[PDB]
Design a protein around this ligand. Structure first.
Ligand SMILES: [Cl-]
Ligand SMILES: [Cl-]
Ligand SMILES: [Cu+2]
Ligand SMILES: [Cu+2]
Ligand SMILES: [Zn+2]
Ligand SMILES: [Zn+2]
Lengths: 153, 153
């Protein structure tokens, strides 16, 4: 199965996020290319519960967390499903990369199809911040761009 | 279950399409509000197979047609699942309305979540055109706006 999200906003940030999962049990390969970020920085990259763009990136809601856990790093046992960590940006402010994740799926009851991918203005502290905000958003700040995850060929 | 699609493009047409379905067997209520169309006209309103916006509204692909039938009116027995007919525009070019459909669903294997809603520049002949193009698109012309159907609260 294949999915795609086109990140857009009015803050100059934009990109594309592709998703690939053969079967439910197999991890999903996430591939991204996002431009217009701050150069040489780490930016929060998350999947939110709703694919609702009626009010900018805010209507996407909280991080997808069907199991009601706290915010963590993608390598953590305790993390939200939509916790993909931080993406690195180069000297030109472009973040290009790829990775696999076993909690993010395009098939089954926890499918992210129809939900939103969000890129942050700030760095995700990965839940290690000494605040309770850290346990929900990683204190990653504003959402300059987002896109609904749709199905593709 | 509730879904929503925000129609956007560079042709001045835009709007919102809401979807509501309680259970699989029950019809889905489609509610829309689209502005920027030609005034006092009928415009093709369809759901396409892919929620892919990487290339404007073109990457949405053909009308959703999992049962491989020809293009028809929503009241036809032979029609594509994404065949919602034409929406009427007023003297100000706004199309506002609502309706229920039993083939369009937000639940099950034919779910439209993650697919695209498209508004046309022209009128859907409803498959009655004397061309084979009529049997696929209804000859509705260009796609000025489209949006991915995402999940919402
Ligand atoms: Cl977020
Ligand atoms: Cl079409
Ligand atoms: Cu976030
Ligand atoms: Cu069409
Ligand atoms: Zn999180
Ligand atoms: Zn059709």
């Amino acid at each position: 199965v294949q999915a795609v999200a086109v990140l857009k906003g009015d803050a100059g940030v934009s990109g594309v996020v592709k998703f690939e999962q053969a079967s439910e049990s197999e991890p999903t390969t996430v591939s991204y290319e996002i431009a217009g970020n701050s150069p040489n920085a780490e930016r929060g990259f998350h999947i939110c519960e709703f694919g609702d763009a009626t009010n900018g990136c805010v209507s996407a809601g909280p991080h997808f967390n069907p199991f009601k856990k706290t915010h963590g790093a993608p390598t953590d046992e305790v993390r939200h499903v939509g916790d993909m960590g931080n993406v690195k940006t180069d000297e030109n402010g472009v973040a290009k990369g790829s990775f696999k994740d076993s909690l993010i799926k395009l098939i089954g009851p926890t499918s992210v199809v129809g939900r939103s991918v969000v890129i942050h203005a700030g760095q995700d502290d990965l839940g290690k911040g000494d605040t309770e905000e850290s346990l929900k958003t990683g204190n990653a700040g504003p959402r300059p761009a987002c896109g609904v995850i749709g199905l593709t060929n």
